[PDB]
């Protein structure tokens, strides 16, 4: 096969491709982090009642667990994602902050 040219080496991975992956990962992170927080609100809400509903606590605990644990894989995903992106790049800056707000 004919080869031996220069495709012109760039720094960092392809931004266009990785940013597309960023969009969905951050999407997943947001949607889960939302209900993860929202569930803690619910647990506290019902736990502050002298007589909390036993079905409602199960409802909350379940959706809480899923999002909470998944936030782990979503976060560790984003951790390496932003680590390959320049901080001058808008996404890289905000993703670091959103992960910082989460736990990192």
Swiss-Prot record:
Q: Which residues carry this modification: Phosphoserine?
A: 12
Tissue spec. comment:
Found ubiquitously. Expressed in heart, brain, placenta, lung, skeletal muscle, kidney and pancreas. Expressed in numerous tumor cell lines, especially in breast tumor cells.
**Which positions fall inside the REM-1 domain?**
8-87
PTM description: Autophosphorylated; preferably on serine. Phosphorylated during mitosis. Activated by limited proteolysis with trypsin.
Location within or outside the cell: Cytoplasm; Nucleus; Endosome; Cell membrane
Q: What is known of its domains?
A: The C1 domain does not bind the diacylglycerol (DAG).
Function as written in the Swiss-Prot or TrEMBL entry: PKC-related serine/threonine-protein kinase involved in various processes such as regulation of the intermediate filaments of the actin cytoskeleton, cell migration, tumor cell invasion and transcription regulation. Part of a signaling cascade that begins with the activation of the adrenergic receptor ADRA1B and leads to the activation of MAPK14. Regulates the cytoskeletal network by phosphorylating proteins such as VIM and neurofilament proteins NEFH, NEFL and NEFM, leading to inhibit their polymerization.
Q: What is the protein's quaternary organization?
A: Interacts with ZFAND6. Interacts with AR. Interacts with PRKCB. Interacts (via REM 1 and REM 2 repeats) with RAC1. Interacts (via REM 1 repeat) with RHOA. Interacts with RHOB. Interacts (via C-terminus) with PDPK1. Interacts with CCNT2; enhances MYOD1-dependent transcription. Component of a signaling complex containing at least AKAP13, PKN1, MAPK14, ZAK and MAP2K3. Within this complex, AKAP13 interacts directly with PKN1, which in turn recruits MAPK14, MAP2K3 and ZAK.
Q: Which family does it belong to?
A: Belongs to the protein kinase superfamily. AGC Ser/Thr protein kinase family. PKC subfamily.
Q: What is this protein called?
A: Serine/threonine-protein kinase N1
Q: What stretch of the whole protein does this chain cover? A: 201 to 297 of 942
């Amino acid at each position: 096969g004919p080869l031996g040219s220069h495709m012109d080496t760039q720094g960092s991975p392809d931004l266009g491709a990785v940013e597309l992956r960023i969009e969905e990962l951050r999407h997943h992170f947001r949607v889960e982090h939302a209900v993860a927080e929202g569930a803690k609100n619910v647990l506290r809400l019902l736990s502050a009642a002298k007589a909390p509903d036993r079905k409602a606590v199960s409802e909350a605990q379940e959706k809480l667990t899923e999002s909470n644990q998944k936030l782990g894989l979503l976060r560790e995903a984003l951790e390496r994602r932003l680590g390959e992106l320049p901080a001058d790049h808008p996404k890289g800056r905000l993703l670091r902050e959103e992960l910082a707000a989460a736990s990192s």
